[PDB]
């Protein structure tokens, strides 16, 4: 005989091995295991809006779009338990490689206002290549909105999403630099 079915409040981030509430700042395509308990112990997972996110048979969730969505779990004894996903203050998207100005526009003038905006993601999710969608990369250098003075010097600084290598004085016309957006 079974007892109440639950989905643990604390998610388990795939890329940094940390158990705590779902981060409020999201990297796109980050993923994370949900812990379902109770019932006859046999669980089935379901997203009710893939556009925003996805979940697999084991409960590994993958953030795909910015929004709010309801992942649900159902057991064998026929109980169901929803785990709501809150809209994140911000979510970071990695677009194609482009020069700084060329990028600024791709991201619709929404580049990371500062380095923090990005390092903060690293602390929350970790080395971005510890995820499905990114696996094939050692590095993902990302432009940072340039300070007013950097503007005059045709340069700007950067931060990587895997290596955390903050680099300054980068000419705005240096190739091999992704145009990471922040919506």
Author numbering: 752 to 934
Copy text verbatim from the article accompanying this structure deposition.
Intimin, an out membrane protein expressed by EHEC and EPEC, is required for intimate attachment to the host cell and formation of the A/E lesions. The binding of intimin to Tir mediates the adhesion between the pathogen and its host cell. Here, we determined the crystal structures of Tir-binding domain of EHEC O157:H7 intimin at 2.8 Å, together with an Asn to Tyr mutant at amino acid 916 (IntN916Y) at 2.6 Å.
These two versions of intimin (Int188 and IntN916Y) were crystallized in space group C2 and P212121, respectively. Topological analysis suggest that Int188 is composed of sixteen beta-sheets together with four alpha-helices, which can be supported by the crystal structure. Both topological and structural evidence indicate that Int188 can be obviously categorized into two independent domains (Domain I& Domain II). Further structural blast revealed that these two domains correspond to an Ig-like domain and a C-type lectin-like domain, respectively. Beta-sheets A′ and A″ between strands A and A′″ extend a platform on top of Domain I that contacts Domain II, helping to define the relative orientation of the two domains. C932 in the C-terminal strand E forms a disulfide bond with the C858 in helix I. Strand E and strand A in N-terminus of Domain II form the principal strands of the first sheet.
